Amino acid sequence: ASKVKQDMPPPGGYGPIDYKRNLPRRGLSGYSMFAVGIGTLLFGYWSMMKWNRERRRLQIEDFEARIALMP
Amino acid sequence: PGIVELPTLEDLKVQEVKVSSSVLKAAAHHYGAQCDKPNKEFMLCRWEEKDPRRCLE
C-alpha cells in the first residue's frame, strides 16, 4: 500500500563532479631564480675572501713563531 | 780515508732549556724580539761553516 521505493538520485540532481586537469603554475620567473642564485654566490665569495685573507695572516704569524724558535 | 773528529761529551754539556713546546710557542714572539743577536750569530755560523762542530760556542 506504500509508494515504490528505489535507489534514486535526489530531486533536482547531483552537484557538479570535477573531471578536468588541474596542474596550477605556482612558480617564479626564471630571472628571479637566476638572480637569487647569483646573489648567493656573490655573498659567499665576499665572505670567503675575507676569511681566507685572515687565515693567510694567521698562517704567517705562526710561521714567524716557528722562525723565532728555530735557532 | 781519515778519522772523523768529534767533540768530547764534556764539550757538549750545556744548561738545557726544559720548557715544553707550548711555553716556547707562547713566548716565541718576544723571544725572537729580545734574543735576536745570539740566534742570528749562531745561524750565520751554521750556514757559513756547514759543520755543527764549528758552532758549539
mmCIF file of C-alpha atoms in Angstrom:
data_model
loop_
_atom_site.group_PDB
_atom_site.id
_atom_site.type_symbol
_atom_site.label_atom_id
_atom_site.label_comp_id
_atom_site.label_asym_id
_atom_site.label_seq_id
_atom_site.Cartn_x
_atom_site.Cartn_y
_atom_site.Cartn_z
ATOM 1 C CA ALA A 1 0.000 0.000 0.000
ATOM 2 C CA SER A 2 3.102 2.185 0.119
ATOM 3 C CA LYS A 3 4.962 4.062 -2.599
ATOM 4 C CA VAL A 4 7.591 2.435 -4.782
ATOM 5 C CA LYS A 5 10.941 2.920 -3.043
ATOM 6 C CA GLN A 6 14.167 2.575 -5.009
ATOM 7 C CA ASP A 7 17.718 3.892 -5.036
ATOM 8 C CA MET A 8 17.338 7.122 -6.997
ATOM 9 C CA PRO A 9 19.206 10.393 -7.492
ATOM 10 C CA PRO A 10 17.917 13.232 -5.294
ATOM 11 C CA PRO A 11 15.250 15.548 -6.732
ATOM 12 C CA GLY A 12 16.939 18.071 -8.952
ATOM 13 C CA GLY A 13 20.238 16.265 -9.348
ATOM 14 C CA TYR A 14 23.763 15.841 -8.012
ATOM 15 C CA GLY A 15 26.304 18.602 -7.610
ATOM 16 C CA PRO A 16 28.876 19.020 -10.374
ATOM 17 C CA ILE A 17 31.699 16.479 -10.492
ATOM 18 C CA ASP A 18 35.081 17.874 -11.494
ATOM 19 C CA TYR A 19 36.992 15.886 -14.100
ATOM 20 C CA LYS A 20 39.295 18.311 -15.956
ATOM 21 C CA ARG A 21 43.019 18.543 -15.284
ATOM 22 C CA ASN A 22 44.262 20.876 -12.535
ATOM 23 C CA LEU A 23 48.031 21.467 -12.559
ATOM 24 C CA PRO A 24 48.499 25.088 -11.424
ATOM 25 C CA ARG A 25 51.552 27.066 -12.479
ATOM 26 C CA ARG A 26 52.812 28.018 -8.989
ATOM 27 C CA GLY A 27 56.282 29.169 -9.966
ATOM 28 C CA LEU A 28 58.626 32.130 -10.046
ATOM 29 C CA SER A 29 60.155 33.623 -13.171
ATOM 30 C CA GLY A 30 63.471 32.308 -14.440
ATOM 31 C CA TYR A 31 65.197 35.656 -13.944
ATOM 32 C CA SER A 32 64.178 35.642 -10.275
ATOM 33 C CA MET A 33 65.738 32.255 -9.508
ATOM 34 C CA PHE A 34 68.871 33.025 -11.524
ATOM 35 C CA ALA A 35 69.278 36.350 -9.703
ATOM 36 C CA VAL A 36 68.843 34.706 -6.296
ATOM 37 C CA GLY A 37 71.497 32.132 -7.174
ATOM 38 C CA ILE A 38 73.983 34.713 -8.433
ATOM 39 C CA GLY A 39 73.457 36.924 -5.381
ATOM 40 C CA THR A 40 74.012 33.987 -3.040
ATOM 41 C CA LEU A 41 77.221 33.142 -4.900
ATOM 42 C CA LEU A 42 78.495 36.723 -4.641
ATOM 43 C CA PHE A 43 77.761 36.905 -0.904
ATOM 44 C CA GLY A 44 79.598 33.628 -0.365
ATOM 45 C CA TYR A 45 82.553 34.820 -2.444
ATOM 46 C CA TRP A 46 82.906 38.012 -0.400
ATOM 47 C CA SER A 47 82.711 36.157 2.922
ATOM 48 C CA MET A 48 85.249 33.560 1.784
ATOM 49 C CA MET A 49 87.633 36.246 0.509
ATOM 50 C CA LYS A 50 87.669 37.974 3.894
ATOM 51 C CA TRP A 51 88.053 34.708 5.799
ATOM 52 C CA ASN A 52 90.876 33.426 3.589
ATOM 53 C CA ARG A 53 92.837 36.674 3.857
ATOM 54 C CA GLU A 54 92.564 36.453 7.647
ATOM 55 C CA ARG A 55 93.680 32.810 7.512
ATOM 56 C CA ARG A 56 96.741 33.758 5.450
ATOM 57 C CA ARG A 57 97.677 36.389 8.034
ATOM 58 C CA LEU A 58 97.338 33.837 10.850
ATOM 59 C CA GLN A 59 99.485 31.337 8.942
ATOM 60 C CA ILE A 60 102.189 33.980 8.503
ATOM 61 C CA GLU A 61 102.087 34.718 12.237
ATOM 62 C CA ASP A 62 102.574 31.103 13.307
ATOM 63 C CA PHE A 63 105.268 30.615 10.650
ATOM 64 C CA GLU A 64 107.116 33.538 12.231
ATOM 65 C CA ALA A 65 106.703 31.894 15.636
ATOM 66 C CA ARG A 66 108.433 28.833 14.175
ATOM 67 C CA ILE A 67 111.159 31.055 12.715
ATOM 68 C CA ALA A 68 111.769 32.665 16.105
ATOM 69 C CA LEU A 69 112.009 29.259 17.790
ATOM 70 C CA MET A 70 114.210 27.626 15.132
ATOM 71 C CA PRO A 71 117.794 28.531 16.263
ATOM 72 C CA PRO B 1 140.308 7.736 4.351
ATOM 73 C CA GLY B 2 140.950 9.636 7.574
ATOM 74 C CA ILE B 3 139.493 9.742 11.089
ATOM 75 C CA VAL B 4 136.316 11.663 11.905
ATOM 76 C CA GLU B 5 136.944 14.005 14.834
ATOM 77 C CA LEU B 6 134.136 14.508 17.329
ATOM 78 C CA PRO B 7 133.839 16.698 20.433
ATOM 79 C CA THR B 8 134.044 15.039 23.821
ATOM 80 C CA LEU B 9 130.882 14.564 25.866
ATOM 81 C CA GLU B 10 132.096 17.204 28.331
ATOM 82 C CA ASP B 11 132.308 19.737 25.489
ATOM 83 C CA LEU B 12 128.664 19.036 24.565
ATOM 84 C CA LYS B 13 127.303 19.780 28.054
ATOM 85 C CA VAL B 14 125.189 22.910 28.500
ATOM 86 C CA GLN B 15 122.391 24.263 30.681
ATOM 87 C CA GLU B 16 119.415 22.898 28.764
ATOM 88 C CA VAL B 17 116.055 24.595 28.226
ATOM 89 C CA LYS B 18 113.489 22.193 29.691
ATOM 90 C CA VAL B 19 110.267 24.056 28.869
ATOM 91 C CA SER B 20 107.676 22.402 26.658
ATOM 92 C CA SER B 21 106.614 23.362 23.139
ATOM 93 C CA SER B 22 103.517 25.258 24.291
ATOM 94 C CA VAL B 23 105.586 27.503 26.573
ATOM 95 C CA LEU B 24 108.059 28.102 23.747
ATOM 96 C CA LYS B 25 105.277 28.928 21.281
ATOM 97 C CA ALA B 26 103.673 31.320 23.771
ATOM 98 C CA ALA B 27 106.992 33.104 24.332
ATOM 99 C CA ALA B 28 108.271 32.868 20.742
ATOM 100 C CA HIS B 29 107.471 36.387 19.530
ATOM 101 C CA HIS B 30 109.102 38.228 22.432
ATOM 102 C CA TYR B 31 111.896 35.635 22.446
ATOM 103 C CA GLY B 32 112.744 36.444 18.839
ATOM 104 C CA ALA B 33 112.434 40.142 19.636
ATOM 105 C CA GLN B 34 114.836 40.029 22.604
ATOM 106 C CA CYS B 35 117.345 37.231 21.872
ATOM 107 C CA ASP B 36 117.863 38.028 18.185
ATOM 108 C CA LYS B 37 121.600 38.747 18.246
ATOM 109 C CA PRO B 38 122.937 35.389 19.573
ATOM 110 C CA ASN B 39 120.412 33.452 17.484
ATOM 111 C CA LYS B 40 121.408 35.261 14.291
ATOM 112 C CA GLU B 41 125.118 34.890 15.046
ATOM 113 C CA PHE B 42 124.617 31.157 15.582
ATOM 114 C CA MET B 43 122.589 30.792 12.381
ATOM 115 C CA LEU B 44 125.194 32.692 10.356
ATOM 116 C CA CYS B 45 127.946 30.481 11.786
ATOM 117 C CA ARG B 46 125.796 27.444 10.984
ATOM 118 C CA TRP B 47 125.071 28.386 7.365
ATOM 119 C CA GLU B 48 128.643 29.563 6.680
ATOM 120 C CA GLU B 49 130.580 26.675 8.249
ATOM 121 C CA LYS B 50 128.271 23.810 7.175
ATOM 122 C CA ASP B 51 129.614 21.926 10.208
ATOM 123 C CA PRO B 52 127.912 21.572 13.618
ATOM 124 C CA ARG B 53 131.317 21.084 15.279
ATOM 125 C CA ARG B 54 132.413 24.650 14.444
ATOM 126 C CA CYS B 55 129.472 26.469 16.091
ATOM 127 C CA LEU B 56 129.166 24.931 19.557
ATOM 128 C CA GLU B 57 130.044 28.101 21.484
#
